[PDB]
């Protein structure tokens, strides 16, 4: 908790996500496994998410 209210809250997770695959070039295929995270019970008019650094340097 910074003195001006700016909070910081990190967790250590082990996410097992779904990566839909089109195995039509097996085994010479390329995939793009996504990881979508958003808010529950809070719409856009209330809680908006944003990357903290340049979007190329966040993940």
């Amino acid at each position: 908790i910074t003195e001006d209210g700016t909070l910081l809250y990190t967790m250590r997770l082990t996410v097992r996500a779904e990566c839909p695959m089109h195995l039509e070039d097996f085994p010479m295929d390329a995939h793009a496994c996504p990881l979508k995270f958003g808010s529950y019970a809070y719409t856009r008019a209330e809680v908006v998410y944003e990357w903290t650094r340049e979007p190329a340097r966040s993940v």
Partner: antibody
Amino acid sequence: VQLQQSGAELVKPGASVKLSCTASGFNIKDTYMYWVKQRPEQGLEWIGRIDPANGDTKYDPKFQGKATITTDTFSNTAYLQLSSLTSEDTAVYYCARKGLRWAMDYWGQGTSVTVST
Amino acid sequence: NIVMTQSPKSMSMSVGERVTLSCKASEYVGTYVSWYQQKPEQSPKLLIYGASNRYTGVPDRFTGSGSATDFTLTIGSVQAEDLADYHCGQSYSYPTFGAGTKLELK
């Protein structure tokens, strides 16, 4: 909400100019602060950005060392100092804050510098 | 370094017709391309933050269209105060702007 830049400068080639950008209406610790240059009748060009909470400043590779970006959180000001300048950077310098989707919503007004003798 | 090739360089169009401008990015920029409207002797004003999201106070005649590399700004019924430059600038990486299009009337 309202960015007040400095006035125009008339500087001799080979000196250092320090342009100021006072942010009124918010705290600079919340957002970033981008500096943009614009030569007359040409496209915009990025100079560098600064994170006023830490002091992490990134510059364009062709602007590293020539320009430096510092801040002052007490007066809510961003300073851009051009270390060594030639007679070519007679452009208009804008000060902007990052917006919602990393756009620059609020821009300054431009301190049109002039390098001559 | 991501470069934004904005087209066309300078177009001339009459009042009341639909107009479209294109901004092709070199590398990938997801939806972080913003469109600014710079009138002469004034500071640029943000029109479209993100792809297809108008900024507060922008008329509904401006519409964006986003993709991975190509982005489009369509103006509908064009009024008489829309004679200005229109820069496209990504923000997915360190921001690099386009060359801009000097809009003209004819």
